[PDB]
């Protein structure tokens, strides 16, 4: 009963519950590159951002931060902004989107990494990114996570190990 | 003079031009996916969210939609819609994070091509690109385009043929 199959398929709930995770999943992981990255024109931005603030500031406390660091902003720059992120600004996906993610170095990816791979053993399971995405967690968080992970699970053991998690990262 | 040359470093605003831009890019590309998809299951809840709209309807008229259309939503769905975006959404956002990208077809991924190729010789160039991103557009935004597009320009000639963005679309 092809229109009875059609009315209780899922596929777009489930892949929605994916897209927001692994979401959530990569800007977790770029907010922890962002506050250990080591090229300093990221760092002192940041500097400048937290002195003005949370971790929210306004669009125009943006702009002077940058302007104060030296920075001649395009005159189109409020158009870019808003592809990123009422008036306000997470300066933090600010630094992100400022940072190339192709030229990741493996060391700083690894600062990333650790903080999902909480027990330290190399792999990032299920239970710890579920831990690191949601932390009273549930049954039912585990196992959105579980599915979550199948796109970047490359070798399908159920676990995220450091080359996954870089591919990932490199977006590559 | 290092102190110098770190002072005169621009690379920071130069990422974040190019990432605001190809996030651009991909949404009106998935944008454009999401309304030719002939997945009928994502086709009705477009129907069901235009008649319930703009682009811009209430979360809680996004979880009536669903509910609508024969649905039962998890209990964090509220945080899952957190994360893909006063507490209204685009839903045609919505609509493209339901869609499964590494599982696009090349048909699909060429009505969103079509667009940005205008003159349908089988290249996106800068001028087209920046056509379909800002459409009276400057000399400064075309230069942008020209820019961001370096990453999924695998070939080096200043264009984007339908390979490099099928590439970009299954994000691999
Ligand atoms: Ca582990
Ligand atoms: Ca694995
Ligand atoms: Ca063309
Ligand atoms: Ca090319």
């Not at 600004?89 to 903080?115: G, H, N, P």
């Not at 949601?134 to 676990?159: A, L, S």
């Amino acid at each position: 009963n092809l229109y009875f199959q059609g009315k209780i398929d899922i596929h777009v709930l489930e892949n929605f519950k994916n897209y927001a995770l692994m979401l959530r999943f990569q800007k977790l992981a770029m907010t922890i590159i962002a506050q250990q990255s080591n090229d300093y024109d990221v760092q002192k931005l940041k500097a400048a951002f937290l002195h003005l603030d949370k971790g929210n500031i306004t669009k125009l406390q943006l702009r002077k931060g940058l302007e104060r660091s030296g920075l001649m902003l395009p005159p189109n720059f409020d158009l870019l902004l808003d592809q990123i992120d009422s008036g306000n600004i997470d300066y933090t996906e600010f630094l992100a989107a400022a940072i190339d993610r192709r030229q990741l170095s493996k060391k700083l990816i690894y600062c990333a990494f650790r903080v999902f791979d909480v027990d330290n053993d190399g792999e990032i399971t299920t239970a710890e990114l579920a831990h690191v995405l949601f932390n009273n967690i549930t049954e039912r968080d585990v196992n959105q996570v579980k599915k979550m992970i199948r796109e970047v699970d490359k070798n399908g053991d159920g676990k995220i190990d450091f080359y996954e998690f870089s591919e990932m990262m490199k977006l590559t």
